[model samples]
Target: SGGAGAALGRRLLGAILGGDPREGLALAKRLYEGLWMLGVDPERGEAILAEVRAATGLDAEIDALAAVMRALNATIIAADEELRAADPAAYAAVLTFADLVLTSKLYPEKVSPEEKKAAELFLKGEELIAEYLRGGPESYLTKGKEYVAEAAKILGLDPAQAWRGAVVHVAGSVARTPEQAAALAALDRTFEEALAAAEARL
Candidate 1:
């Protein structure tokens, strides 16, 4: 119905799918009605999504709303392929690619078992990360440890990599207080490092 570009489209879509609807909608409307303001050209494919997804370093949970978009749409190989094939540089404007997928019938929208499970498990980690938002380290161990195995199995990634990213994710995410956020961040780093070291020891 309109000539919206991909970046704008993505923001709108993200807003539509995100928690803060009215605020985003207000922002979305003003930005669009203002004659459209401005908007990555990275490698394409599932691996790229994984790189970004894992890069979140949540190791315990999937980070960002992109987690849902990514895990849900990208857990399968072909979907990633078609998404990339449609636009070689899909990473620069992700939802752009999503829009590309939306209009075209070529995309095979399928996330039945594997991704569904992965996303579900990843959601758990996301919950844990939210704890970091509050500067709380209440229950970070078992919740993250148990399901961590499934992703390694399902996604076929290494514990070392996940551990490294996990530390990075926790460190980068928190900011409640100098001591509070720092305490939990350090705690995560320590915990994930121990897990990583243990994996290597085994």
Candidate 2:
């Protein structure tokens, strides 16, 4: 059963490398979709594509394909998670981590409870950040702090790391204003205290 998919992957690799890079890219896409049809996990498809890209020495095609796959994978994950939570914050955080993958070219699987907790904290933080950005009452800032603190407590991670990952999306919400700058700084300080308090607890 699986060997058929494996054989297909091997064939795709040969076909792609034997031809043009653009053709390779196209064949890689076809291979990716073909694997999916064969019930292969998407990440496995990505791995195959990545290997073929390296074997073909096609950085240009690889770069473009990487961008497309990152977004495509993110979109799929966000949709899947959204069906379960249906929360705006969760959806937003999925994008948050997706963009992180785009930059870091890394995506961790949500297979562990710790990873799941971190994901929850990320979504909650993004939710609070969004509320604060929408001119909601300053209470959103308070809520954000609590969310990060809770995440730190649950994960036993440095509060800084928790805040760093959880509220990073908030930084992008910054608008051009002295008031906004001041607000951002205050938010920064709030996370700073959250980190310190977390450190104190340890």
Candidate 3:
């Protein structure tokens, strides 16, 4: 039963750690096996977002992407509810991953009239992930540096600490299956540590 997941984990690790996105598609296939899991239809989503951005501008594009993210997030939430039992920690990890990608893809910049639309698009994409994930307390998906700024509550936990928490959450899931455990761990530790090191140098 878990053999496929194990194999997928290895493939994704090869793509991710090996610098490829092709593995992601394979992983997506494994993730949806036996279950009715839906996502932002890649063809519909990836192309539409680009087309919308080109036709409208950043602001409008951001609004459109946010709407898309919200819909996707809701789909995940709904799928998990209907199919698998709720797993808060796992969900937290998933949400964090989603937020990280969205933020990085659409980095925020100062608003300008000439680039107001684009700037807004960028900021709003980040916010869309932020607002949607404001559900969990230990959520790594904070609006600003809220996770860092309010670290006093989790006093011993700086950004590094929070990220490590997310790593453990994801790693825990990957560890459950033998096929993907090793590759997943390697991929997780390598990037997680790299990101922490980069942040520390800042």
Candidate 4:
């Protein structure tokens, strides 16, 4: 039973440390199912988070990915109240893991108040983006922009720096023609801006 969780942890470590978004998302889905089966053992869940944290060196990008996983965990747990009640241990584990992810040193805890606020806002933006992807109301995009704007303000960053992915995704979603040079150019500009911000951080 714990084997599934152990594997999920390893995949998370690989994804975060290896900088592979595709792999991270794939394992995140497995982690969702595995957490359901493993039930909510808080101790077991913390162990998993600890193991991944130590393995990944806890970088900023890794923190971002973990936030993504954290959101997914919230969705799963919320949608399966019956399952959580049926297996309290598994529920506890999942709950604990989700909380730990948010309060982790890579996120809120151990950071300055401004930094914490920025991180929280960033995660909220990503959560909204996920909601947008799941066919939630178009207003999710607007909500996401609010989060990104506030986060960037707190971090003293350009709003575009925080929303390059969202901008490109929305653009690509609406682009009808492959020959839409202007649309393609906008995508490139967004990517470049994001890359520049990342490089500046480094």
Best by TM-score: 2
Worst 10 residues of 4 by lDDT: 33-42
Q: Which predicted model would earn the best lDDT?
A: 4
**Candidate 4: count of backbone clashes, pairs at least 3 residues apart or interchain:** 8
Provide the overall lDDT of each model, using Cα atoms, as 2-decimal numbers. 0.37, 0.46, 0.36, 0.46
lDDT accuracy of residue 57 in candidate 2: 62
Worst 10 residues of 3 by lDDT: 32-41
Question: Candidate 1: misplaced stretches above 4 Å?
Answer: 1-108, 175-202
- Model 4, runs deviating above 4 Å: 2-5, 8-109, 166-202
Q: Write the per-residue lDDT of candidate 4 for residues 38-140, one digit (tens) a residue.
A: 2223334445544545545544543443443333344232333544566444333324334433444222445667667676776677678766866789999
Model 3 lDDT at residue 17: 31
For model 1, what is the error of residue 116's alpha carbon versus the real structure, in angstroms, after optimal superposition?
A: 1.6
lDDT per residue (tens digit) for residues 3-29 in model 2: 222333334444553436444454544
TM-score of each: 0.33, 0.37, 0.21, 0.36
- Candidate 3 lDDT over residue span 32-112, tens digit each: 221111221232344444543443344443344334333424433344343224444434433433433333433334223
**RMSD of each predicted structure:** 18.6, 18.6, 15.2, 20.3
Off by over 4 Å in 2: 1-52, 55-58, 65-110, 173-202
Candidate 1 global TM-score: 0.33
